[PDB]
């Protein structure tokens, strides 16, 4: 009978809610009431990268924190040199509807995907010297939303058919599949030790996955609308999400509940991207009002504004050593802030 | 030593990007949208994953995309098509049961935040079936739309066919002109299953849209 199963499911949901309520005793805001404010964080544009014809959806930094890759809707991948603004490479793509890009940890490969439902891997260091397609990973049903390189051989991708997958680039078959989401999976974030990852969906839900065991461990709720971005804390025991209700929230894996929310009355536009600084003290979030705000993670008080873009901010990333932050936008211009 | 090689590579990439810029600015992009019942596939085949179609009229290149490999929920991937010249909307006017679904989809597209600057070209397809159904006087329209009982025409078979055609067109135009910022319009056309003027109609409508954009840009509007 379906009715008894539904009653049992809601009974377990009530039990989980009661356990979470009992496990909470204090709030993070009151614990951090005795620390000093960060102050006014003023950042200036140090570089402006020009050359993209159309709007930008994705970018990714390199491990050396010098070269980065950006994807655009005219159908081009460009590898930059943020020190001198020289275009190292320019890769023309087969499909112009590209929604994501990735940079290999070893720096030999890049990947991209979009409405074509196919993820393609490019070899930047071929023996001849040119850039050619190395593999085309097919098997997803919806559009590709995000992809991340575990290492030179394994890549994890999320699609719009409410599933994630783990690929083997050498052979091209799906090693593992992750299921359980109800809406489109919009973003994923790998753990610092690359043993777990999270994923946000259009169901206002986030889940924690085990790469080896291949099952969902925990599920976190609290948002009221679709989730657009997600990012791990530097120590690997927390993450932050950005949604369409114009709020961000910080979740803790061990406590298995929300810790703090970052919102203001004057903001009515959703968040398109989030990121953390090197030490985790500052949280940077992009908004639909053409601005990016800098938050105080331990205080939930705004501390800075970046106002250099004339259109929607789509992507935002911070280098490994935290020397700079790069933000792309829908007006086809990248900017390095410091 | 490496600076000279880096500069030479940058210059080569800039030249290639300039050529690509010229080629990209040359052409125009369109989005073909509709339902399964509507004969949009037949339309795109008449002037013939994502089904691209390139046609050229008066030495001007047009590009049309018909995405069909996705799921039912389209509120997230629809934001990739906010820079197109126009949206082609195809409606099967002979099916009264699913006309309100078309009206709701049109309202959702018209009132979107990122699609509030894109003009829509409306095609009211399947005219012969509508004429046959109206003449055969078996399935009535008044019971689906009770407002049809107090409507007067503002075709050759009878005035009733004209009345029905313009009633449906007026429904769509009322939704269009209800809420608007005078930044985008709607161009309704009456097309049948077999016609050869769709390319010319698209050319004229796109020319009007572009001219209006240029007038606004040059402060004349």
């Amino acid at each position: 009978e379906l009715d008894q199963l539904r009653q049992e499911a809601e009974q377990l949901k009530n039990q989980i809610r009661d356990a979470r309520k009992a496990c909470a005793d204090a709030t993070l805001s009151q614990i951090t009431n005795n620390i000093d404010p960060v102050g006014r964080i003023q950042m200036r544009t140090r570089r402006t990268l020009r050359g993209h014809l159309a709007k930008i959806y994705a970018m990714h930094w390199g491990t050396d924190s010098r070269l980065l890759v950006s994807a655009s809707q005219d159908g081009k991948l460009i590898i930059w040199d943020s020190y001198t603004t020289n275009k190292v490479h320019a890769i023309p793509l087969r499909s112009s509807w590209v929604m994501t890009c990735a940079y290999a940890p070893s720096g030999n490969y890049v990947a991209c995907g979009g409405l074509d439902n196919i993820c393609s891997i490019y070899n930047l260091k071929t023996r001849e010297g040119n850039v050619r397609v190395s593999r085309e990973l097919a098997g997803h049903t919806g559009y590709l939303s995000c992809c991340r390189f575990l290492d030179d051989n394994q890549i994890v991708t999320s699609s719009g058919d409410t599933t994630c997958a783990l690929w083997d680039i050498e052979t091209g078959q799906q090693t593992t599949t992750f299921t359980g989401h109800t809406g489109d999976v919009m973003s994923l974030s790998l753990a610092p030790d690359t043993r777990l990852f999270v994923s946000g969906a259009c169901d206002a839900s986030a889940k924690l996955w085990d790469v080896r065991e291949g099952m969902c461990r925990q599920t976190f709720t609290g948002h009221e609308s679709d989730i657009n971005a997600i990012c791990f804390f530097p120590n690997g025991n927390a993450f932050a999400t950005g949604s369409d209700d114009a709020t961000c929230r910080l979740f803790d894996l061990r406590a298995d509940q929300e810790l703090m929310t970052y919102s203001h009355d004057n903001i009515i536009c959703g968040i398109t991207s989030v990121s953390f600084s090197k030490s985790g003290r500052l949280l940077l979030a992009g908004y639909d009002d053409f601005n990016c705000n800098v938050w105080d993670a331990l205080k939930a008080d705004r501390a800075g504004v970046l106002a250099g873009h004339d259109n929607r901010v789509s992507c935002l990333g911070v280098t490994d050593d935290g020397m700079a932050v790069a933000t792309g936008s829908w007006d086809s211009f990248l900017k390095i802030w410091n | 030593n490496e600076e000279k090689a880096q500069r030479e590579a940058n210059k080569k990439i800039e030249k290639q990007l300039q050529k690509d810029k010229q080629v990209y600015r040359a052409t125009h992009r369109l989005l073909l949208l509709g339902a399964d019942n509507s004969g949009k596939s037949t339309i795109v085949k008449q002037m013939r994953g994502i089904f691209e179609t390139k046609f050229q009229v008066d030495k001007v290149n047009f590009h049309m995309f018909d995405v069909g490999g996705q799921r039912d929920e389209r509120r997230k991937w629809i934001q990739c098509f906010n820079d197109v010249t126009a949206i082609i909307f195809v409606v099967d006017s002979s099916d009264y049961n699913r006309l309100q679904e078309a009206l709701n989809l049109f309202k959702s597209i018209w009132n979107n935040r990122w699609l509030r600057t894109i003009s829509v070209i409306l095609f009211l397809n399947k005219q012969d079936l509508l004429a046959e159904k109206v003449l055969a006087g078996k399935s009535k329209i008044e019971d689906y739309f009770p407002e049809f009982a107090r409507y007067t025409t503002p075709p050759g078979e009878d005035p009733r066919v004209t009345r029905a055609k313009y009633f449906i067109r007026d429904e769509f135009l009322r939704i269009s002109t209800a809420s608007g910022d005078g930044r985008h319009y709607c161009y309704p056309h009456f097309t049948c299953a077999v016609d050869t003027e769709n390319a010319r109609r698209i050319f004229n409508d796109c020319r009007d849209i572009i001219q209006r954009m240029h007038l606004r840009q040059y402060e004349l509007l």
């Epitope: 109800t182 259009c202 679709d226 369409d244 959703g270 | 959702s108």
Partner: nanobody, 126 residues
Framework: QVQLQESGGGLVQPGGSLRLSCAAS????????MNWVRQAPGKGLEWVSD????????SYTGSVKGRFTISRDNAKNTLYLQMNSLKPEDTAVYYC?????????????????????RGQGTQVTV
């Protein structure tokens, strides 16, 4: 999480009356546009009515005009549908849908097969 529970179904003779109520929780009710959706047996999801954020604008489908009335109570976070002069073609399961995003006036995908912010449904038979 978003929770929408509907109640009010039952057996009604033709020409009778019936009232449907939906209790909403887990989100701010006053920032969202609410819908009523029904699904007849052997037929897909069909839109019925919607009401604005404050109830200023009300619209219905063609076949229910003059018989159905939709209202919302922001004070207690409830939605209502007042059925009148029921017909044998009105038998279906009634779902209450929600606008995906706040402060907007467009509603994508409320009638989809796997919409997330939709209720379990109640059975109405005449």
């Amino acid at each position: 999480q978003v929770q929408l529970q509907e109640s009010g179904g039952g057996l009604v003779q033709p020409g009778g009356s019936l009232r449907l109520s939906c209790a909403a929780s887990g989100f701010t009710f006053s920032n969202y546009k609410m819908n009523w959706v029904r699904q007849a047996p052997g037929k897909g999801l069909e839109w019925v009515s919607d009401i604005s954020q404050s109830g200023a604008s009300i619209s219905y489908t063609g076949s229910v005009k003059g018989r159905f009335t939709i209202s919302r109570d922001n004070a207690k976070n409830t939605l209502y549908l007042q059925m009148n002069s029921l017909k044998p073609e009105d038998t279906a399961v009634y779902y209450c849908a929600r606008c995906p995003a706040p402060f907007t006036r467009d509603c994508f995908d409320v009638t989809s097969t796997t919409y997330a912010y939709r209720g379990q449904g109640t059975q109405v038979t005449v």
